[PDB]
């Protein structure tokens, strides 16, 4: 009893949870969480790197502003007053 | 040419197998398991039946004391009762008022029914698997009966058959079994000389012809009623009669995998468990050459009617261009689809009609007619 | 069937998602390195 | 096969309905309401 | 019911209306050309 296809997109993906065995979806969820953590860690690193770039030009004196736009969203808003 | 295939161990299901010997026209063989028998080796421990309490006329010793002697008989019971004064229709049986004794004696033996009504206790070990296979070979149905051990070679019309070994060594029979007429029971029956009163084995006979029997019926002789000639006693009722009503459903009804249980000899028939490998050494007789077989081109497939079910609910019309007249083998190249026809006759620019079985709602399959493949697209309905 | 870790998923569709990943963590790693490189250029410039 | 359709409650108008059972040739049924009777339950007062 | 295979398969279909009058009765005439796989009876029905 079935003439439906597989999945598309995830939907059916969760339907399989009924087949195979017990362990499955929870492990996948954990993997997804790990991926999210990697994504979050990357972003945190990127922000720190963005600071590393705005460093030097963190003292004072004209000089961007300037490259502060084009400028990874701060850069500016930052140059100003 | 040796053709090797594996079919599920299921009776009444025809399976199609494509034999493709290189340089020879394809051959389609239909195989169907007619019966699969699991016959265990039996060793009779004992037989049981209804017991008989043999009680002769009591020895009423008038004016004296009777004496009991130890008799080597099953459940032998003897008791001498003092102070008896029994009466018959015409008065007192004894001359003396006091000092009369009644010797009551009894023993247990097999009832007259034991030849007709009995249960046999068997020790069942390592069953030999046997299979009856129907093969549609050269437009004729051939029957092959062989042991499913993968060693027993059976030759029918020059084709050598090697059946098994069975993927499952499972049996519905335990180490100890009990047989009553056409019914078999898995029972850890008491050993000989260990039978309990009012239970299966209260009476035990090693063979049905055996003169000496074991008996444990809790036979106890009682003091007769005042002025009465009789032998009163207390005894646990027939263990065999009790087992007959307490046995429950036999193996024919309780066994897994849809096992059918038969007797004379005790065997498990059509237990749908595991798969069965089949080896067929097909003679050169039924092996034409590719060059000697028709060549098919310009093949097209149309499915005008399809229903996805256990039987052949699909119909397919295949158009072809054959180089010459002759017989071509028909086979499905997709395992999800099976074709009823094993062989059809081809001739030039003509068409063929085949019957197919599938469980798929959208069945896309390849059909090999002789040495050429054709794609079939089918929308099958429930 | 035949192997271990329950295989499931999707040609096409499957490729759609796969093509995404490997793709953003590597990017931000490369960008991080490039930012460091530029920083060193500034350090050299001073 | 159960074929379900809805026709307007109008007498003397033939309606055509297409019965399409999957895997079976289409079937055309002509339906016409000959009469529609509304009979109330009566209780004689006097 | 009659199975599709028991019946005929139709292809290369074209429709021409040489005469039509919009009224309560059958005021329209339509000529339908076809290519049938085999001889048999076919049901005719308007999908509109």
How would you describe this structure to a colleague?
- The structure is cut from a larger assembly and holds 1 copy of chain A (81 residues), 3 copies of chain B and 1 copy of chain C (46 residues).
- Chain A is mainly α and 81 residues long.
- Helix content of chain A is 43%, strand content 0%.
- The N and C termini of chain A lie far apart (71 Å).
- With 382 residues, chain B is mainly β.
- Chain B is built from 2 helices and 30 strands.
- Chain B has helices at residues 239-246, 251-254, and strands at residues 2-8, 15-19, 27-49, 51-54, 59-61, 77-82, 87-88, 91-92, 101-110, 118-137, 140-147, 153-156, 159-163, 176-180, 183-186, 203-204, 214-215, 220-221, 233-234, 260-262, 267-269, 275-281, 296-306, 314-322, 326-332, 337-339, 343-346, 349-358, 362-369, 372-379.
- Chain C has 46 residues and is an all-alpha fold.
- Chain C has 2 helices and no strands.
- The longest helix of chain C has 21 residues, at 25-45.
- Chains A and B meet through loops of A and loops of B.
Cα-to-Cα separation, first versus last residue of chain C? 65 Å
So how many helices of chain A?
A: 2
Oligomeric state, counting identical vs distinct chains: part of a larger assembly
Helix and strand pattern of chain C? HH
Strand content of chain C: under 5%
Task: Give the helix level of chain C as a range of percent.
Answer: 55-70%
Q: Can you summarize the main beta sheet of chain C?
A: none
- Proportion of β residues of chain A? under 5%
CA gyration radius of chain C, whole angstroms: 20 Å
Could you give the count of β-strands of chain A?
Answer: 0
Structure at a glance:
Chain C: Residues 44-46 are cytoplasmic. This is part of a larger assembly, with 1 copy of chain A (81 residues), 3 copies of chain B and 1 copy of chain C (46 residues). Chain B is mainly β and 382 residues long.
């Amino acid at each position: 009893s079935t003439n439906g296809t597989a999945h598309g997109h995830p939907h059916e993906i969760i339907l399989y949870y009924y087949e195979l065995y017990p362990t499955m979806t929870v492990v996948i969820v954990s993997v997804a969480s790990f991926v999210l953590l990697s994504m979050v860690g990357t972003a945190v690193g990127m922000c720190v790197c963005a600071r590393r770039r705005c460093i030097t030009p963190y003292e004072l004196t004209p000089g961007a502003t300037v490259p502060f736009l084009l400028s990874l969203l701060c850069c500016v808003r930052t140059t100003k007053a | 040419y040796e053709h090797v295939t594996v079919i599920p161990n299921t009776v009444g299901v025809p399976y199609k197998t494509l034999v493709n010997r290189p340089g020879y026209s394809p051959m389609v063989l239909e195989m169907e398991l007619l019966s699969v028998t699991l016959e265990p080796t039996l060793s009779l421990d004992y037989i049981t039946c209804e017991y008989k309490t043999v009680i002769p006329s009591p020895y009423v010793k008038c004016c004296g004391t009777a004496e009991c002697k130890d008799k080597n008989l099953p459940d032998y019971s003897c008791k001498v009762f003092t102070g008896v004064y029994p009466f018959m229709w015409g008065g007192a049986y004894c001359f003396c008022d006091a000092e009369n004794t009644q010797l009551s004696e009894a023993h247990v033996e097999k009832s007259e029914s034991c030849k007709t009504e009995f249960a046999s206790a068997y020790r069942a070990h390592t069953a030999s698997a046997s299979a009856k296979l129907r093969v549609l070979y050269q437009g004729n149905n051939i029957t092959v009966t062989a042991y499913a051990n993968g060693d027993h070679a059976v030759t029918v019309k020059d084709a050598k058959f090697i059946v098994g070994p069975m993927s499952s060594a499972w049996t519905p029979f335990d180490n100890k079994i009990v047989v009553y007429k056409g019914d078999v029971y898995n029972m850890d029956y008491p050993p000989f000389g260990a039978g309990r009163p009012g239970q299966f084995g209260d009476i035990q006979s090693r063979t049905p012809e055996s003169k000496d029997v074991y008996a444990n019926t809790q036979l106890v002789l009682q003091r007769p009623a005042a002025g009465t000639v009789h032998v009163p006693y207390s005894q646990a009722p027939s263990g065999f009669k009790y087992w007959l009503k307490e046995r429950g459903a036999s193996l024919q009804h309780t066994a897994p995998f849809g096992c059918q249980i038969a007797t004379n000899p005790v065997r498990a028939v059509n237990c749908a468990v595991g798969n069965m490998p089949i080896s067929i050494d097909i003679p050169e007789a039924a092996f034409t050459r590719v060059v000697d077989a028709p060549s098919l081109t310009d093949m097209s497939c149309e499915v005008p009617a399809c229903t996805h079910s256990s039987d052949f609910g699909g119909v397919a019309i295949i158009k072809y261009a054959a180089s010459k007249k002759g017989k071509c083998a028909v086979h499905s190249m997709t395992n999800a689809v099976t074709i009823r026809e094993a062989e059809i006759e081809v001739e030039g620019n003509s068409q063929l009609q085949i019957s197919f079985s599938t469980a798929l709602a959208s069945a896309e399959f390849r059909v090999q007619v002789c040495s050429t493949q054709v794609h079939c697209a089918a929308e099958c309905h429930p | 069937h035949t192997t271990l870790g329950v295989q499931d998923i999707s040609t096409t569709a499957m490729s759609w998602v796969q093509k995404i990943t490997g793709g953003v963590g590597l990017i931000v790693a490369v960008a991080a390195l490039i930012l460091i490189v530029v920083l060193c250029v500034s350090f050299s410039r001073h």
